[PDB]
Amino acid sequence: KDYLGRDDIDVSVYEPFTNIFYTNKSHLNGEDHLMGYYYRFAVINVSIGDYFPVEIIDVINEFKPAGVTLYVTYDGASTIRGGAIIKWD
């Protein structure tokens, strides 16, 4: 939010290791996934609801802890001009 020119944008960090499928607690057809390469600890996916330069990744590299893989997601819904709902009638 500092590198970009505004603070009101929606930004959040997703931690996929919270959705690791445990035997007991995790629902069978629920939101959890089997453990593997992506659903793994030391992994984070950052959602950004605004246009960003690719150098923002390098910016995150300055702040993220060493030994964590980084992924960035661009949410195009947040950047739609005006109301995003499309009409036919």
Partner: protein, 70 residues
Amino acid sequence: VYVYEETGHITVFAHDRNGNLSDTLKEDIIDALQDYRPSGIMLDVTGVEKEEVNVSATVTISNKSRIGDT
């Protein structure tokens, strides 16, 4: 507080003056440590393994007149 470190997991042992860890205090600790924990690492809070020691003692005394409840 005692912090025990494992690969990919952190567990925090905390206790009050009585050696207990209330659920409210556990939730407070979790909420405070949301800001502290590393990204992509799991953090857990647990109560200290309290051990209540029962002691029954036989005390020999010299002054037999001073024996009393006090």
